[PDB]
Ligand SMILES: Nc1nc2c(ncn2[C@@H]2O[C@H](COP(=O)(O)OP(=O)(O)O)[C@@H](O)[C@H]2O)c(=O)[nH]1
């Protein structure tokens with residue numbers, strides 16, 4: 040039948056939202072007959088009260104997601120899917136005869152940072168999976184560690200790591216390469232023609248089961264290849280375990296990635312420590328409603344060695360967990376060394392293990408951590424707050440949404456929408472509005488974020504029946 | 508396991524609420540840097556936007572309550588519970604040997620109106636059910652019908668309507684009356700001592716099952732005795748069927764009870780038609796998100812014969828279903844007579860069949876309609892908006908709540924609250940705040956309504972196993 044707690048919680052969520060609406064209607068009407076100081080003090084007081092009121096609703100929603108076996112079922116179903124995908128990838132990557140295997144050769148040496156390079160391999164991997172070719176990762180002279188991938192990670196194959204074959208060619212399309220045994224894939228920006236096995240689409244054979252389980256199936260798919268790629272060598276597995284003990288990493292803990300140095304004034308903006316911490320504080324207030332928070336722990340990953348001292352001074356009621364020598368190694372002068380490589384691998388590891396992630400998704404470092412985080416819980420798709428971009432995968436196809444409720448523009452900055460219009464989302468402004476193009480009309484501008492739904496794209500991937 | 512629609516909807520409720528919070532933080536920050544007419548225009552625009560947003564959340568919460576068979580299950584369980592209770596009541600009321608049966612004698616001539624008098628009979632009935640006494644209703648000279656209860660309703664017993672017995676006494680307590688066959692019950696104001704079988708408590712053997720099904724078990728329990736009492740005589744049953752056809756009562760329709768005449772200046776205030784209609788319009792806006800509303804219908808029940816015309820000209824886009832001659836029969840100089848009794852019974856009936864009820868809960872007329880409504884759907888506990896009181900039953904024990912989140916008073920009109928404090932609630936101001944007494948501190952004042960939860964009270968009632 041129906042669960043007692045499920046029904047109490049659903050009714051409490053309804054009633055809490057109603058009480059919030061009652062409160063808002065009364066307070067905004069009072070507010071619009073004030074001025075000067077009294078107007079501003081009341082505005083602030085309303086926001087304070089709304090914060091706690093909204094967090095109690097979120098708290099009941101968290102409980103609703105777990106009652107009456109839901110949490111256990113979601114865990115068992117997520118575990119079952121990941122074991123299936125990993126089992127497929129492993130079968131693909133370990134043919135019996137390497138001399139006769141179809142192969143796709145990826146070169147790690149894209150000229151960029153660790154996250155960008157890791158995502159390059161993921162993109163190679165996703166296309167190899169889609170074309171039923173064993174991924175051959177060539178990583179000699181990898182600028183972080185010229186010994187190659189196996190400096191930190193397991194080889195991507197136990198049986199087939201050789202690039203030999205009866206015929207080799209540069210990628211030219213799935214059909215043309217039908218009978219070519221070894222195909223060389225370039226970086227995505229040089230890829231012509233593009234195949235369908237790219238983010239943010241998901242395999243159509245997994246799409247239905249994924250909706251039952253995960254809030255963002257596109258990231259889940261990406262993360263399955265990240266999971267396989269970062270299988271640690273024995274020594275790295277030990278380094279992570281030793282770091283966990285030495286740093287005192289324990290829960291609850293919130294991860295904060297503050298990207299500075301060369302990202303400032305090229306691809307992203309400078310963000311002061313206070314802009315990250317408002318969301319850290321907001322989230323610990325949430326956690327405190329459902330668990331006791333002995334100590335407010337923040338794992339701080341940054342390429343600015345001076346930030347740790349600044350944060351500690353400004354937030355003395357927080358315990359900042361952070362490896363300042365790792366920060367030093369991320370500086371421009373030492374970035375492309377093995378010591379630095381392991382610094383970022385560890386920072387990304389602990390970022391990914393946190394209960395919540397606050398950062399700028401414009402940085403590949405945070406995206407990797409967010410991606411890995413998906414492999415650690417049934418549905419961690421919402422456990423982040425980004426100060427700029429929404430989730431994206433460099434080289435993805437167009438991210439589209441579908442308008443569900445009509446919108447009449449109130450200013451010229453807003454675009455109109457009718458239920459069913461394809462909206463190409465460029466970003467969420469985290470203020471109730473997103474920016475995108477209404478492809479129906481060809482107009483670009485702002486629209487209310489709640490009035491659209493995600494347009495999840497599917498692709499016919501192989502399902503590797505033999506892997507069972 | 509978990510339903511696909513259930514999970515999509517829960518996540519959409521979460522995101523919808525997140526986006527509402529993002530919107531409010533942005534818009535309230537903007538409001539506090541505006542003044543004058545500019546400030547008032549933006550505040551009105553924000554409220555329009557918020558309304559549509561809140562209803563999209565409420566709509567999804569509605570859909571959530573129906574997915575994966577929850578509606579069918581809720582329907583079947585509500586039917587079993589009422590069939591069980593009615594079967595028990597019918598067993599209690601119809602002993603084989605009336606001359607030997609324990610009886611409780613109730614006199615209908617409490618000096619008040621029909622709703623108050625019906626609830627007096629409910630109060631007698633409830634105490635009779637708890638003490639395993641057959642209810643004996645004495646209704647001669649009823650101010651509404653000199654011929655008594657059976658002028659309109661069926662006798663409360665088919666086998667035992669005679670007050671005879673070997674001993675008789677005035678109420679003096681279940682223990683002192685253990686061996687007294689016939690006990691005479693006064694009105695609740697003169698009841699000494701009080702037994703446990705009064706609202707808002709519910710029977711402990713039903714309490715868990717009612718929480719799975721119903722949002723206000725106290726009203727559900729009351730409604731079970733109302734349902735039994737208003738079983739109609741043949742002439743009145745046909746009268747109801749003919750009024751339905753003649754008035755064009757069909758769905759969707761919203762019931763509006765406007766109580767004036769002698770209630771104004773004594774127990775309630777005058778409320779203009781506009782005040783009821785804002786909530787009528789708001790609920791039709793909600794309904795339109797999930798269904799096609801061909802016409803916006805209102806069943807107007809009122810004791811002011813001049814209102815139907817004013818309402819019709821003020822709301823030319825609405826269809827008003829009303830019996831103006833019933834409104835006239837309710838006039839002060841002619842209210843206590845059968846034709847008027849018939850009028851209020853039909854008015855209450857149609858109010859109770861509406862999809863939503865807008866009224867003043869300070870009027871017993873609306874409370875009766877709200878109670879009957881609980882017997883028409885699995886869970887209609889929330890299908891109302893009162894302009895003044897919350898639900899209450901005349902004579903009920905103290906309605907207490909339990910503070911769940913702490914509260915520091917911002918003004919002197921508010922009371923402090925700590926988790927666990929017992930709060931005796933006087934009312935809900937429908938603005939985010941309630942009024943009550945923090946019984947721990949002995950302070951009266953205002954507190955945020957969402958910070959408390961309802962303290963469901965249970966009583967050990969007989970279960971009448973023999974009734975199966
Ligand atoms: N250890 C560590 N290294 C960082 C951090 N932020 C940036 N770096 C270094 O700078 C590089 C940034 O390049 P990339 O991973 O492609 O991410 P992006 O440039 O921020 O988009 C990383 O790979 C690291 O080597 C940090 O918080 N910790």
Ligand SMILES: Nc1nc2c(ncn2[C@@H]2O[C@H](COP(=O)(O)OP(=O)(O)O)[C@@H](O)[C@H]2O)c(=O)[nH]1
Pocket residue numbers: 619620621622623624764765766770808809810833834837842847850851852854869870871872
């Ligand atoms: N037919 C009809 N009678 C009404 C209406 N409002 C009030 N009355 C009459 O006035 C009485 C009001 O007394 P009561 O039922 O105890 O409720 P209350 O006085 O409003 O709290 C009703 O019982 C009716 O007899 C109405 O809308 N329709």
